[PDB]
């Protein structure tokens, strides 16, 4: 009745048998490293901790290379509808020069399938911005959601809309995204995929609904969703195919490079790069911490 278990990535090794680790240059041009697992294991990057598993960057040594040392993993599994429940202890912080995000990707060629950034933000942002990314011709309306409309074209080449901005929403919980939900012990995330829409849920830690972890969660008794995409200005079932998840922490590059010298971040040094490379132990708090990832389907 509503939703059922399809995939539970469990923990550890088990959960990084399911994904497949991306070292290609980064396409978001970052100042990134994107090492296989042997390599991340080695360097601390990946790992289990206390149960939970935990996906970090390097923030011991002064990057050399490509950029700072990081790992992007991408689901095995694609899905086409469902929820994706993610449990986090604790996600990349609010730290300068990083550029976090856990995210879904339609297969095929780019933007054709779709993409959905369920967490993300760069630098210091303090609230969780909810995007999509798709092909011309999907605009969203305005209700539905707590959070704030920024913009309401997805396509990636909108007229008036910065390259790729997408139509994002911004949380308006100050402890959705970073430093905030780091000091509350982290949340939920539960994004839902349907041939009408998509919408995204935030419980920080504690406030979840009884059902969101079990085998039969129904996000129709929920709250209202931090952020929902829908209306009649988009195909919502052609505009998205097969999703496959997404971790990855990246630096600078197209959106946190670029914006580095507008914000609270301009002071840290003249360039974004130039931070990333000679300040490591900045980014201690970079990482993932796992509770539990769990994907459903109708
Ligand atoms: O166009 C050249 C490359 O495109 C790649 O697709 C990328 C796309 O270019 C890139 O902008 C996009 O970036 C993502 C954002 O759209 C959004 O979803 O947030 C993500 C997390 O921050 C961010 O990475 O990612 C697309 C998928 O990687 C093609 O994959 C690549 O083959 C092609 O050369
Ligand atoms: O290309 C040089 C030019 O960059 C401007 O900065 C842009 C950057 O080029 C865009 O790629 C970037 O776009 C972001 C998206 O990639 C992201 O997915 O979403 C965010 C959110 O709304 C987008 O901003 O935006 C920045 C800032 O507009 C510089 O401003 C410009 O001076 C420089 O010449």
Redesign the pocket.
């Known amino acids: 009745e509503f939703y059922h278990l399809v995939d539970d990535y469990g923990r550890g090794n088990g959960f990084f048998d399911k994904f497949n680790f991306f070292t290609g240059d980064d396409p978001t041009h970052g100042y990134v490293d994107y090492v296989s697992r042997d390599v991340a294991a080695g360097a601390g990057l990946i790992g289990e901790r206390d149960g939970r598993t935990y996906m970090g960057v390097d923030f011991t040594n002064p990057a050399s290379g490509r950029g700072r040392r990081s790992v992007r993993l991408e689901s095995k599994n694609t899905y086409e509808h469902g929820l994706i429940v993610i449990d986090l202890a604790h996600m990349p912080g609010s730290v300068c020069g990083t550029w976090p995000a856990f995210w879904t990707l339609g297969t095929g060629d780019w933007p054709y399938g779709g993409a959905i950034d369920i967490i993300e933000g760069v630098n210091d942002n303090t609230f969780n911005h909810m995007?999509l990314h798709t092909s011309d011709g999907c605009t969203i309306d305005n209700d539905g959601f707590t959070g704030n409309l920024?913009?309401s074209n997805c396509y990636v080449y909108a007229p008036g809309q910065?390259?790729?901005?997408?139509c994002?929403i911004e949380a308006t919980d100050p402890n959705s995204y970073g430093k905030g939900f780091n000091s509350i012990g982290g949340g939920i995330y539960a994004t839902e995929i349907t041939p009408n829409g998509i919408s995204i849920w935030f419980f920080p830690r504690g406030s979840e609904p009884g059902d969101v972890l079990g085998d039969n969660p129904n996000p129709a008794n929920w709250d209202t969703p931090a952020a929902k995409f829908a209306g009649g200005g988009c195909d919502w079932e052609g505009k998205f195919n097969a999703q496959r998840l997404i971790f990855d922490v990246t630096f600078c590059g197209?959106?946190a490079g670029?914006?580095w010298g507008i914000g609270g971040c301009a002071s840290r040094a003249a360039n974004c790069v130039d931070f990333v490379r000679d300040n490591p132990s900045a980014f201690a708090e970079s990482y993932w911490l796992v509770n539990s990832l769990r994907v459903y389907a109708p």
């Open positions: 995007v920024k913009t910065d390259a790729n901005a997408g994002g197209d959106w670029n914006v």
